[PDB]
């Protein structure tokens, strides 16, 4: 993964302008054609989301944001994918996306063929391999009857998934039944695959609109170890503070923070992030503020 991100309420007529056409996209084709592609939620806090079905419920809650407060929005894609008729759907067969995928499948026909009795295993012996050092699934069939034939099919990391019950294709482009009289296993060019499943949400981002001027500091700006500097007496004698939580925890950067929102002597709402990676330094600071 989620972009975070944090933006002026200045700065967020251009999240309007990217939300109202991340909005009108929808489905154009499959079982949600028509229907909106991304799952957009505004809300005051991560606590207090709402899901918005138009732009306009944004644009109300952005124009209507007060001084050094702040509205939250998630962008989530509801899944989505192009498929072979070049439309936007919802949904696809899963595919194989590691080396253990692979090896999983050759155990799995493996075993299916010693009873199957659908498709492809009714009229064909199968043989399902995964060679580690290709990294391939490689499947290898045989007519069990008549004028024998054979096909073998490599299967990769980022292919479709393969069902041998379900019709393969042939040259033609037809899904042909391999119960056909006359069907030999030769005449396949690709493998059917396993059955569609709804796209897995992904959340994009997380932005938090703040209606205030945003700057960030060090502790050292607002205090040198026993006293506030002139900065942080001009921070200190703002009206209407609101100072946040001891620390940030880390993240991925070392540096711990905490914010002060006030209003300046001019009347403009500020809100300043105090961040350092010593985590006593900037509690001090913090301290000499209260």
């Known amino acids: 993964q989620v972009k975070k991100e944090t933006?002026?309420?200045?700065?967020?007529?251009?999240?309007?302008?990217?939300?109202?056409?991340?909005?009108?996209?929808?489905?154009?084709?499959?079982?949600?054609?028509?229907?909106?592609?991304?799952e957009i939620k505004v809300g005051e806090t991560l606590s207090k989301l709402k899901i918005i079905t138009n732009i306009d419920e944004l644009e109300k809650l952005v124009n209507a944001l007060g001084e050094n407060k702040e509205l939250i929005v998630t962008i989530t894609d509801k899944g989505h994918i192009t498929n072979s008729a070049n439309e936007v759907?919802?949904?696809?067969?899963?595919?194989?996306?590691?080396?253990?995928?692979?090896?999983?499948?050759?155990?799995?026909?493996?075993?299916?063929?010693?009873?199957?009795?659908?498709g492809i295993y009714k009229?064909?012996?199968?043989?399902?391999?995964?060679?580690?050092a290709k990294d391939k699934l490689?499947?290898?069939?045989?007519?069990?009857?008549?004028?024998?034939?054979?096909?073998?099919?490599?299967?990769?990391?980022?292919?479709?998934?393969?069902?041998?019950?379900?019709?393969?294709?042939?040259?033609?482009?037809?899904?042909?039944?391999?119960?056909?009289?006359?069907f030999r296993v030769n005449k396949i060019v690709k493998l059917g695959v396993a059955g569609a499943k709804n796209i897995d949400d992904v959340q994009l981002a997380e932005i938090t609109i703040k209606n205030s001027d945003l700057n960030?500091?060090?502790?050292?700006?607002?205090?040198?170890?026993?006293?506030?500097?002139?900065?942080?007496?001009?921070?200190?004698?703002?009206?209407?503070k609101s100072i946040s939580d001891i620390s940030s925890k880390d993240s991925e950067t070392g540096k711990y923070k905490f914010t002060i929102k006030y209003t300046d002597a001019s009347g403009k709402a500020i809100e300043l992030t105090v961040e350092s990676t010593n985590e006593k330094d900037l509690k001090d600071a913090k301290a000499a503020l209260e």
Request: net charge negative.
């Open 7 to 38: 933006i002026t309420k200045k700065e967020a007529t251009e999240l309007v302008s990217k939300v109202r056409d991340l909005m009108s996209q929808k489905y154009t084709g499959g079982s949600q054609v028509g229907q909106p592609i991304y």
């Open 89 to 118: 759907v919802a949904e696809a067969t899963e595919k194989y996306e590691n080396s253990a995928d692979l090896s999983a499948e050759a155990n799995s026909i493996t075993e299916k063929a010693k009873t199957e009795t659908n």
């Open 123 to 132: 009229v064909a012996d199968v043989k399902a391999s995964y060679d580690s």
């Open 138 to 182: 490689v499947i290898t069939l045989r007519d069990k009857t008549d004028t024998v034939t054979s096909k073998t099919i490599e299967i990769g990391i980022g292919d479709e998934k393969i069902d041998l019950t379900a019709n393969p294709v042939d040259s033609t482009g037809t899904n042909l039944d391999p119960s056909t009289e006359g």
């Open 216 to 240: 960030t500091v060090s502790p050292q700006d607002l205090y040198d170890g026993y006293r506030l500097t002139v900065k942080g007496n001009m921070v200190a004698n703002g009206t209407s």
